Amino acid sequence: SMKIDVVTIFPEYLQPVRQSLPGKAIDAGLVDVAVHDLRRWTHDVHKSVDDSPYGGGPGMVMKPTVWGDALDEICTSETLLVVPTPAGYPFTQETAWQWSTEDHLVIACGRYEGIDQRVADDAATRMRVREVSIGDYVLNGGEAAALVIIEAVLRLVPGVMASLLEGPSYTRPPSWRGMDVPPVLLSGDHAKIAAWRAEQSRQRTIERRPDLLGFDS
Amino acid sequence: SMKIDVVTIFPEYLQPVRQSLPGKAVDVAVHDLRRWTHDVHKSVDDSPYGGGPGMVMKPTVWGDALDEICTSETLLVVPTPAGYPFTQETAWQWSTEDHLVIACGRYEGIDQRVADDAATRMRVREVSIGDYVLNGGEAAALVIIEAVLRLVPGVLSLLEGPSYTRPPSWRGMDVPPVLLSGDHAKIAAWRAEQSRQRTIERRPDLL
Numbered sequence: 001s002m003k004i005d006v007v008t009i010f011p012e013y014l015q016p017v018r019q020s021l022p023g024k025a026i027d028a029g030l031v032d033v034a035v036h037d038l039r040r041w042t043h044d045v046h047k048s049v050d051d052s053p054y055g056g057g058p059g060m061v062m063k064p065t066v067w068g069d070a071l072d073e074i075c076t077s078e079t080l081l082v083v084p085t086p087a088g089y090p091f092t093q094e095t096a097w098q099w100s101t102e103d104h105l106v107i108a109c110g111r112y113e114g115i116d117q118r119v120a121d122d123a124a125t126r127m128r129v130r131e132v133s134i135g136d137y138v139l140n141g142g143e144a145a146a147l148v149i150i151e152a153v154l155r156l157v158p159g160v161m162a163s164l165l166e167g168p169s170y171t172r173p174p175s176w177r178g179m180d181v182p183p184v185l186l187s188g189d190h191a192k193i194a195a196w197r198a199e200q201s202r203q204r205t206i207e208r209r210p211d212l213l214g215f216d217s
Numbered sequence: 218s219m220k221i222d223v224v225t226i227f228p229e230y231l232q233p234v235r236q237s238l239p240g241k242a243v244d245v246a247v248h249d250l251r252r253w254t255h256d257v258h259k260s261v262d263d264s265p266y267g268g269g270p271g272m273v274m275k276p277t278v279w280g281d282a283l284d285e286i287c288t289s290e291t292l293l294v295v296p297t298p299a300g301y302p303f304t305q306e307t308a309w310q311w312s313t314e315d316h317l318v319i320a321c322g323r324y325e326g327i328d329q330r331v332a333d334d335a336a337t338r339m340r341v342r343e344v345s346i347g348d349y350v351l352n353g354g355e356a357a358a359l360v361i362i363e364a365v366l367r368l369v370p371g372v373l374s375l376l377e378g379p380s381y382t383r384p385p386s387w388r389g390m391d392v393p394p395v396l397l398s399g400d401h402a403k404i405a406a407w408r409a410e411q412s413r414q415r416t417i418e419r420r421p422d423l424l
């Protein structure tokens with residue numbers, strides 16, 4: 001089994017849905033996903049979770065006190081704390097394979113301006129902490145990135161991307177709107193099909209992701 | 218305004234939620250791909266030609282769905298780990314589009330003829346949001362929608378360094394004193410250096 005805790009100020013957005021890969025995983029008892037409203041650990045009347053940044057700048061920064069109290073209750077020393085952020089280490093397929101063997105992931109969802117850095121620094125004295133980016137784009141907060149990470153990881157768990165791009169794929173019918181499936185794919189010749197698909201893959205990779213083959217992007 | 222149509226066999230999963238950025242909402246409609254299936258079994262995929270594992274999404278089903286939802290002005294977005302990379306620059310570009318249609322399929326793919334055919338009468342962009350595989354494009358659609366919509370007015374280099382707020386001392390850690398100094402040129406220089414060190418440590422590829 002695996003336990004995933006997600007902490008967010010948008011709990012409804014992160015509520016697991018039965019008809020989904022994570023929903024299936026949950027139902028098969030392979031993972032338990034629990035979502036927590038960050039505001040549960042506030043004490044003030046207007047349940048404030050953020051404040052203006054020291055040093056100036058646009059936006060707000062999430063308060064360390066509230067996150068501190070939440071992670072105190074949810075995490076143990078065995079927890080792998082995941083914090084989505086544009087500023088993080090890259091989250092890759094390798095990362096997904098690695099986290100697929102973890103007993104307990106806690107995903108801290110915060111606005112992109114950041115959670116006060118002292119939260120992650122403090123947590124790091126007790127547990128493993130991974131600040132990660134799923135890609136080079138900005139979201140308002142970590143929530144969508146958490147859903148991506150959960151998807152990528154849960155499909156790898158026992159019971160539930162190489163280094164090239166997969167080429168085009170086809171299915172029936174063999175002709176459609178005047179466009180024909182590549183005759184080699186209909187030929188039954190596994191060796192020539194494998195050769196064709198290898199070529200297509202390399203051709204697609206050169207065009208769309210030349211960086212994967214060690215060329216200028 | 219902006220119109221976004223999402224096509225998926227998981228419409229519940231992609232149903233917009235009020236308590237979110239996209240909920241603050243610009244028009245977003247989610248369509249169940251099964252609405253365009255031809256058989257009582259509501260089949261949306263089939264075995265890949267040439268063999269191999271997994272399934273490939275049927276072109277006859279997707280072709281109908283797209284014929285109905287797309288127009289000449291449509292930008293057809295297809296999330297796929299085999300795509301061109303989706304970046305901030307892409308999100309900016311798409312932020313001024315009048316009509317996005319996002320075709321969510323399983324990662325093995327939609328029959329290539331669907332995109333090829335569509336590209337003869339509309340603009341088509343197959344894109345990847347990162348180097349990892351998901352079972353389907355659904356979560357990637359959420360990310361794309363999140364990244365694009367926050368750039369639409371009225372729906373609101375180096376790595377950013379650490380940020381801080383009150384209190385000035387917390388569990389033994391003090392906010393860097395430079396930040397409370399009132400020397401704003403120095404603060405900018407300090408932040409530049411923090412950004413440089415973080416970019417070196419976490420994303421050396423950017424330098």
Ligand SMILES: NC(=S)c1ccno1
Nearest residue numbers: 085112133134139141
């Ligand atoms: N690119 C990531 S992980 C992100 C999180 C919040 N905003 O962007």
Ligand SMILES: NC(=S)c1ccno1
Nearest residue numbers: 297298324345346351
């Ligand atoms: N990396 C992307 S966009 C993806 C979609 C489905 N599987 O991976």
